[PDB]
Ligand binder design. Structure first.
Ligand SMILES: *[C@@H]1O[C@H](CO)[C@@H](O)[C@H](O)[C@H]1NC(C)=O
Lengths: 100, 49, 49
């Protein structure tokens, strides 16, 4: 048995049921064998009918096509950042401030 | 830019995507594949520093 | 692929690139089946390298 894995619709796989499509929130997604995490939004890209998914300058998947409806979805990571704690000495006080 | 572009190198593994390796193959070989990728990326970070 | 252990006790079942163990979650473009008959001593010849 030889399996073909390309940038194709890939319409041969096991009996996994699909769920509804929810947008504008960080969720776990499995778009036709492609797993990931993030928020999916409506995309304004000019995809061509033979194209399936997009890519960015950082060479990662940032756009997908719904295998049920001809809709392009942009994938972005959910919110992220760094946290800094501002304190005087513990010999002085136990109060702190937080910088996001 | 070089640091960002160094993320598409397979470093001798089957793929550069962690999810594909974890979903397409068993843990016994996933260990070595992810080890190769992690070592490559750590080397890139150390070189940048 | 769940219903595949329902024949005579298989003497060779070797899978390269995908773990057979409950991994029917992968979606492929097309599948090719190549069937033939050989002798037992030649079975080891059907492998990469
Ligand atoms: C079935 O898939 C086709 C693929 O294009 C789509 O057009 C159609 O709307 C789908 N049907 C349902 C009920 O989702």
């Amino acid at each position: 048995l030889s399996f073909e894995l390309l940038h194709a619709p890939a319409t041969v796989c096991g009996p996994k049921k699909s769920t509804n499509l929810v947008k504008n929130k960080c969720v776990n997604f499995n778009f036709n064998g492609l797993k990931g995490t993030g928020v999916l939004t409506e995309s304004n890209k000019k995809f061509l009918p033979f194209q399936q998914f997009g890519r960015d300058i950082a060479d990662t998947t940032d756009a997908v096509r719904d295998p049920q409806t001809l809709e392009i979805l942009d994938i972005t990571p959910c919110s992220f950042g760094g946290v800094s704690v501002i304190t005087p000495g513990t010999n002085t006080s136990n109060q702190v401030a937080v910088l996001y | 830019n070089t640091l960002v572009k160094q993320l598409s190198s397979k470093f001798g593994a089957i793929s550069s995507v962690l999810n594909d390796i974890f979903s397409r193959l068993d843990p016994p070989e996933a260990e070595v594949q992810i080890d190769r990728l992690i070592t490559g990326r750590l080397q890139s970070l150390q070189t940048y520093v | 692929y769940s219903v595949l252990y329902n024949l005579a006790p298989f003497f060779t079942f070797k899978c390269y690139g995908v773990s057979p163990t409950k991994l029917n979650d992968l979606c492929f473009t097309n599948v090719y089946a190549d069937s033939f008959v050989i002798r037992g001593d030649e079975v080891r010849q059907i492998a990469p390298g």
